[PDB]
A paper describes a structure:
Finally, we obtained a three-dimensional reconstruction of SPARSA at an overall resolution of 3.6 Å. The pAgo protein is clamped tightly by the N-terminal and C-terminal Sir2 domains via extensive interaction areas with estimated buried interfaces of 1400 and 1500 Å2, respectively. As no external NAD+ molecules were introduced, the bound NAD+ may be an endogenous molecule that is trapped during protein purification; these results are consistent with the findings of the previous study, in which SPARSA was shown to bind NAD+ in vivo 21. The NAD+ molecule embraces α2 of the Sir2 domain, which causes the nicotinamide (NAM) ring to be almost parallel to the adenine ring. NAD+ is buried with surrounding surface interfaces of ~850 Å2 and engages in extensive hydrogen bonds and hydrophobic interactions. However, the activation of SPARSA NADase does not involve exposure of the active site for NAD+ hydrolysis, and apo SPARSA can bind NAD+.
Recently, short pAgos in conjunction with the associated TIR or Sir2 (SPARTA or SPARSA) were found to serve as antiviral systems to combat phage infections. In this study, we investigate the newly characterized SPARSA phage defense system from Geobacter sulfurreducens (GsSir2/pAgo) and describe the cryo-electron microscopy (cryo-EM) structures of NAD+-bound complexes of SPARSA in the absence or presence of gRNA and tDNA. Our results reveal that the APAZ (Analogue of PAZ) domain and the short pAgo form a featured architecture similar to the long pAgo to accommodate nucleic acids.
Residue numbers in the entry:
A (entry chain A): 1 to 584
B (entry chain B): 5 to 473
Write the structure that this text describes.
Amino acid sequence: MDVLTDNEFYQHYLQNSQHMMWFLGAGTSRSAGLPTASDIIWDLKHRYYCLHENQDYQKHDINNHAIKSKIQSYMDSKGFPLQWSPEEYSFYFELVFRDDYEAQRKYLLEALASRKVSLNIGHRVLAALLEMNQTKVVFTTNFDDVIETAFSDISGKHLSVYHLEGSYAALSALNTEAFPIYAKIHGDFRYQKIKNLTPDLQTNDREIHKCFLAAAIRFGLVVSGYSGRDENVMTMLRAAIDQNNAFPHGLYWTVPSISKSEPAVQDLITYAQGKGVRAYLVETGTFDEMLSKIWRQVKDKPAAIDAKVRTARVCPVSIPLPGPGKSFPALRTNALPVVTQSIRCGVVTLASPITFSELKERISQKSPKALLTYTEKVLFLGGEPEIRKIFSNDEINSIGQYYIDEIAQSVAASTFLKSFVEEAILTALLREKPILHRVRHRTHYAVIPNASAKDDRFLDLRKAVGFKGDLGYITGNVTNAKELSWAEAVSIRLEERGGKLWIMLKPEIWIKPLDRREEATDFIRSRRRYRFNQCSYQILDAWIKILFGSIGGGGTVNISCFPDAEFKAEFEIGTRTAFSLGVG
Amino acid sequence: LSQLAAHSTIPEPLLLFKDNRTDTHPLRGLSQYGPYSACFNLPGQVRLAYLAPTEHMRKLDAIVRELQNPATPKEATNYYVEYGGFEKVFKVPLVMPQEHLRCLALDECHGVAANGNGLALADKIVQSMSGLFRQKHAFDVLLVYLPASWKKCFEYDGFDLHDRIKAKVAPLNLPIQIINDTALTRQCRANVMWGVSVALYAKAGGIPWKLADWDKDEAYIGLSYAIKKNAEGQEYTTCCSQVFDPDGTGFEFVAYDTREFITDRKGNPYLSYQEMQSVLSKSLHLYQSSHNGRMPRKIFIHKTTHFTEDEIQGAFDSFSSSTEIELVQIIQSTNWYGLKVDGKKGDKPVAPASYPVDRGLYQPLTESECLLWTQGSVMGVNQQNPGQPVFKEAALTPLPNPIMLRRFSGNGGWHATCSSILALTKVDWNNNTLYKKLPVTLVYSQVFADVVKQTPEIVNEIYDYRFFM
Ligand SMILES: NC(=O)c1ccc[n+]([C@@H]2O[C@H](COP(=O)([O-])OP(=O)(O)OC[C@H]3O[C@@H](n4cnc5c(N)ncnc54)[C@H](O)[C@@H]3O)[C@@H](O)[C@H]2O)c1
């Protein structure tokens, strides 16, 4: 009963944002660093419980929600004050400390001294809403300066405070309609003796009480972040309810969770409903959530206020910078650097647009010796007779070359272009060599041919794949299969990392049919079981010197894709694989 | 030239045990010293309960009896230490259940399991489980045995029988422990014994071990999502979150269901600005409640997928303006692998090493990406032959595979991030080995989101970690 969804308490506020006054509490300052009364009380309780060092310490181990309930029930067993009661604070303080005012002062100066008070989104939003005249009256029971600092930062001026000094001015300003007012209300008969308050200050407190009564005579209350611990505040609220036509636009009590509400607030809401007031117990999550969802729909936002409320654009400050190292234990990768940021490609324009699938099936049916691209316009790296020969149709307009500059970012952005570049690189690589070529799952491999698995070119591969210096076998068939021929292979991939192009190699073995992979995987595991660091080093070196010409020179080999053509591609892949060593 | 900057090594993190003693090996530290002690916390009498057919109750009783008797590795396991019984090590008695706590299902589940059914078996388990809820306040951890006939229908591409049973059991705050046929079999008693005893103590409420570097003031948040289909055919996303201290723990979550989310061409959802802001604000609210109003000075946010421009701004608007927020993306699969090449000394020139790369090596690549290993050679934890490194994964993969970290925020310093990830790797209580491939935040959040996804309704509650996992 008397429960609305958050959405229902967002259209009512949008229309009547001008007829609303806020009653804050200690929960609207918990996100800023300052602990609330519940946190202090729980700290005292678990210190008394002997859950931790009961003399002086910090860093509790477990709080949970079952341990907390166990502690609260154990307290309630002996007859300790009920939860959410004004008697609880002083009672627990006296029980835990048992005089020793010096220890009390050390506790309060250890729990609230090195607390970096800082703003959150909700406080900035509230300060902005105070700047542009949407919310007029704000009431609070806190002893902090979060809202004042927020208003000073957002606006640049100073807030008008009407606490115990200048209390009589609150009603006069309300009657004269001085809109921005921020009135504070003290606690329960204990803060009076803390500051040695004279009875004149008690008269001042009831002054802000009459202020509240008259404000409710003309506004609506959206009290948030309050628990009902004080009874003076509850009595003043009840008196305000007793006034005729109290809160014409309704009284809203926002809580983070209804299932974790307080009995006192339920009693107050029931009384308010009984008297005939539009009182609802809404659940809007935390304070920051509510204030941000409110700030979303605020209209006529000045540019400066909006810029000052939300966080500015986060620059890419994520720039750590490394340097070269000097120490002996090193690390060898599997990546070969590629240094060629320029290719020449041929183009052709089609009168009738074609799709990627149609081009692929035409290539599959009418296989040329040329490469093609498919994003929106076809770029090729083949020969002039062949481009005339493929799909013909005489829809060609121009064959003006298209230079490709800074291929790194283009490869990083697109996906088909990266595959095209990888295909061109591999075609240049495998040219004039007996190694095979397979394109399984867009993960181009290089399989050793079984017909010529006896050349001296693969002698090192056989040597580095055997056991104890003996020659091994780089090509054969699976044990329990006559149609599962296997051969040593390597997968070549192209990767982009921050403006550089790497070629990644990985040893693997290839299966001919490609459709019978279960026993193939079993055979892969049995073969690769004993391939540790020392064997992998030799295998990688053998594959590198098999593919990229020869090593020892330590330079940058050059490969050409279709060298005797008008549109060729040249690359300068290095022979040595990138390494690293450092610390020192 | 191809000199890839310089690498660095993080020393292996240390764990904290009873009476403030430190060791890198969890099992050995538990054996000599015992679990971490903090107050009493009341795992003073770990009482168990049974849920299994009376024809299969004997084996469960047998394993519970074996839990209180010593066991030996029986061979050169190279990692495991001799088990001394539950009275030893844990310093806490284990109580066998009496006749009053022997609830069971009679005959309904056998034919259903033979037919490969789903939700109905879980609901019948829930009804017997309610028969046990009539007596909940008699035990701490509950033992459930699902025979191989019920393993027949354990899962089918999604729905998992134990996972859905746990999903239906968790919201009512009672822990369970699943014991499958592997534990009774596999003939290596010592390996099983260390894997179940620790989990029972953790679910009872205790803390087995804890990181020894806890003086820093930081927090680690892990986010994961799961796509679920509610009624009337509408797509929903369950974004679960979990916050850690620099010493592990992290007993609570924020479970939140959302509708406003985009989706790329892989099924990965992306929260909007408001949804991310709400999730992180609820996470901060949870952290403040459990730590008596303390706010962390630095916050680490770990996610598997990248951060959209809206999600980065959503994160910065949830915490205060004086809190350093650093967002990290962790990728499991990478095209790079590394080999160690030492040598020189005086004997011979450089040559490949006999063992793979160290665990703590990390290699910066670019202005935003780094290669952290978290997998490889680790020294000082060998039990078969001391003084030799153990790869600990020579059976699965002969070579370790690194992981890539991308940073969408943060001021500087790869050392802090890599050290935090490596330390968080070692604090998973459901595995018996040294480490895992991923930090505990991601795996925990993922499994908890997977469990939450199976709820029929929309949940926006705050849960506990014992009742899940
Ligand atoms: N900041 C301060 O000055 C301060 C701090 C502690 C206590 N006090 C004193 O305690 C007395 C009683 O204060 P109280 O009534 O607020 O007691 P309280 O601290 O118990 O109120 C806390 C209530 O706010 C809710 N809350 C907590 N965090 C929230 C969040 N992030 N968003 C929304 N709601 C949240 C809590 O659930 C609870 O209902 C006052 O006199 C007050 O002066 C003041």
